[PDB]
């Protein structure tokens, strides 16, 4: 059934599973026309498909050409997502295929179920958690590769960098969701926290800065304060 706080540790067991977030698949800028009407212009998007145990991220870049001449794009985007996730599963060797796929938005359930009919043993699950994966395009290297794409492209990352050498996947996922929640709630302030010391460098082959264990404690503390503050600046408390 649905994934929630009560069954949270299931994410880090040894059954392969993927989260699928479609938030950033169909992305537009809304603008005025010469006649004073409003129009949209699409920009490149991405499917965020993530193994929470290993950190492996399958970033399918959605090039704006896929929308050309199509109607009801917000609806199409859910079915395009499901098409691409199904294609990804079919491309994986059997022993790498997931046993569950957890969609972050319930509106993905039927499109994914229909595209995965050939995989009756793969469970398609919703979640009650409010996961911050929409903020993935606040990660500079992810944003960069999406915007530069000139054609459909899949790019593979490990969203945990090398963290699993030193911490467990429960702790790594907690760190990731904290970073992404902060970026979602106040992007400028979160980026200041991560990047105001240029000597703590991002390795060429990484996404996040090369913080020591003690620096990660300080960073994580700063992210919590930002989230609680914004919750303050928001509701006035």
């Amino acid at each position: 059934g649905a994934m929630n706080s009560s069954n949270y540790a299931e994410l880090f067991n040894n059954d392969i599973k993927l989260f699928v977030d479609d938030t950033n698949v169909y992305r537009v800028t809304v603008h005025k026309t010469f006649e004073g009407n409003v129009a949209t212009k699409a920009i490149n998007g991405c499917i965020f498909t993530l193994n929470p145990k290993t950190g492996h991220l399958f970033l399918k870049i959605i090039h704006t050409s896929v929308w050309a001449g199509q109607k009801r794009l917000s609806q199409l985007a859910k079915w395009k997502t499901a098409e691409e996730v199904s294609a990804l599963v079919r491309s994986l060797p059997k022993e790498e295929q997931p046993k569950q796929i957890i969609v972050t938005r319930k509106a993905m359930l039927d499109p994914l179920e229909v595209h995965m009919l050939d995989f009756p043993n793969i469970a398609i699950r919703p979640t009650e958690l409010r996961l911050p994966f929409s903020a993935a395009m606040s990660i500079d290297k992810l944003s960069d590769v999406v915007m530069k794409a000139t054609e459909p492209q899949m790019v593979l990352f490990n969203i945990y960098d090398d963290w699993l050498d030193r911490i467990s996947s429960y702790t790594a996922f907690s760190r990731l969701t904290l970073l992404l929640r902060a970026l979602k709630t106040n992007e400028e302030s979160a980026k200041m926290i991560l990047l105001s010391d240029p000597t703590i460098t991002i390795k060429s082959y990484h996404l996040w800065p090369s913080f020591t264990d003690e620096q990660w404690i300080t960073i994580e503390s700063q992210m919590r304060d930002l989230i609680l503050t914004e919750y303050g600046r928001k509701y006035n408390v």
Partner: protein
């Protein structure tokens, strides 16, 4: 005009014949039903006074043989049986008719209700849904489950309705996932009408049979099948124009006949709101939409 004689009435029972019904008291001198119109299937059904559990009954066509009802004290129900001795049947019925021990099928002459509810229903096809080949008549009751229900447990006692499942490989062409899920025309027209049913008359007949079992027996699996067959048509953008017009008439008479006090359990809110107000055919069921709005505006 044919006759379904009754050996006796040893237990108090409400007896239905099509849309009519009457109460018979324990050991009341009742010996059956006469003047049954020829040319239609019929259903004769029972609800015992003491145990309203299990409505049950028999679908039959008097053209196919001489049928009668005799109560079985061992199995505790009124059973239909076929009398193969035509002379014995004529003579026993003649005595019963002469003593005026039979009720008369009380058909008003203006009234086409039963024709309209059974227009496409045939016993030969009904026997395919209810498999008991040694009999010419078919038993149904409140509890029998459908093949599709069993898949999700006695197969001999199941309602073999056509399995409709919108999230199934049968319903969804590989490569046309979104197209086929959002517009079910290829599932309706190619898979079901051309492939399985063979024509719309067969589609309408099973749909009508599914409704009548839901209404008369409270058979939940039949209600599921009725709604699924409606939803499959309404969710198709491409439906032959004669089919839509006929569906509107079919549904109008079903809604007209439904007991007002059973609408809460026999009508699925989601299907009807989707069919009448959201679907491709939202504008094609004028008679059905008008009676639903004047009779059940709450459901909507």
């Amino acid at each position: 005009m044919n006759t379904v004689p009754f050996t006796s009435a040893p237990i108090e029972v409400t007896i239905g014949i099509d849309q009519y019904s009457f109460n018979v008291k324990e050991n009341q001198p009742f010996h059956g039903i006469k003047d049954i119109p020829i040319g239609h299937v019929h259903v004769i059904h029972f609800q015992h006074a003491d145990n309203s559990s299990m409505r049950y009954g028999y679908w039959f066509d008097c053209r196919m043989g001489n049928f009668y009802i005799q109560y079985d004290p061992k199995d505790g129900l009124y059973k239909m049986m076929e009398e193969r001795d035509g002379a014995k049947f004529e003579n026993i019925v003649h005595n019963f008719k002469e003593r005026q021990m039979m009720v008369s099928y009380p058909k008003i002459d203006e009234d086409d209700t039963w024709y309209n509810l059974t227009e496409f229903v045939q016993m030969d096809k009904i026997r395919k849904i209810v498999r008991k080949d040694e009999n010419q008549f078919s038993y149904v009751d409140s509890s029998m489950t459908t093949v599709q229900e069993n898949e999700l447990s006695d197969p001999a006692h199941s309602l073999n309705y056509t399995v409709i499942n919108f999230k199934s490989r049968e319903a969804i062409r590989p490569g046309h996932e979104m197209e086929d899920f959002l517009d079910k025309s290829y599932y309706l027209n190619t898979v079901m009408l051309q492939g399985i049913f063979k024509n719309s008359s067969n589609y309408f007949g099973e749909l009508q049979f599914a409704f009548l079992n839901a209404m008369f027996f409270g058979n939940y699996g039949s209600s599921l099948q009725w709604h699924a067959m409606i939803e499959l048509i309404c969710s198709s953008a491409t439906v032959p124009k004669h089919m839509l017009d006929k569906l509107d008439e079919i549904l109008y008479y079903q809604i007209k006949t439904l007991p007002e006090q059973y609408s809460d359990i026999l009508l699925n809110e989601r299907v009807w709101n989707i069919c009448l107000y959201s679907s491709f055919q939202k504008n094609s069921l004028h008679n059905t939409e008008k009676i639903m709005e004047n009779k059940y505006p709450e459901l909507l």
